[PDB]
């Protein structure tokens, strides 16, 4: 305590903190590139998706809504964007 630099927070404890309580608020979510097991072409998906994302180029269900992060279908791969 006492002499603790609030100007230069450490990255680990900055991620440790709540998203709204950081020096500058940074959301915890991200955008994923989801690849279906059979379809050759990728889809952009929100991590905390609240809707049943359907394959635009097929009938496969890509993710299911949950309390927090959306659950990807088994086999459907994903890569973090940016």
């Amino acid at each position: 305590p006492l002499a603790k630099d609030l100007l230069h927070p450490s990255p680990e404890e900055e991620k440790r903190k709540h998203k709204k309580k950081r020096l500058v608020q940074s959301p915890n979510s991200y955008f994923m590139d989801v690849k279906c097991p059979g379809c050759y072409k990728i889809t952009t998906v929100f991590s905390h998706a609240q809707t049943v994302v359907l394959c635009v180029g097929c009938s496969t269900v890509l993710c299911q809504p949950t309390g927090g992060k959306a659950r990807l279908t088994e086999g459907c791969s994903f890569r973090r964007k940016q």
Binding site: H18, K19, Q25, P27, T44, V45, A49, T51, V53, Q82
Partner: protein, 149 residues
Amino acid sequence: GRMHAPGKGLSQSALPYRRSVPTWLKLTSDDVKEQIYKLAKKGLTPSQIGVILRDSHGVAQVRFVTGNKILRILKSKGLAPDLPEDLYHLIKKAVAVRKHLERNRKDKDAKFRLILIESRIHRLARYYKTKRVLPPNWKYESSTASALV
């Protein structure tokens, strides 16, 4: 804290610092606008439009891409709700609780919650009157509440 509940929760979205469109986003402002228009024709409120665009089409903030908010976009072209969506949802909730109450006369929690919902409706309606969104003679009536929704 909550307006009508004792709870004091801290749960909301945290928009990022960067207001620039991400490079991977290949959608143009016009494409986003047409997607918004057809989603509105499907019968969705601006909230649902934003959720669908964020979930499936990979746009973070429509205002961030098109330089303009969703409701303004809908009102600009013409197809916008007669009364604001939050007021509409409040009226719908009040109608539902009233319908439940008229048959369950013994329910006293429902009466209390209904009064809370009416207070919220009145506050919102008075605010919208002061901003000229609603006509000054617009008033909430239980008899015509179901008609409005």
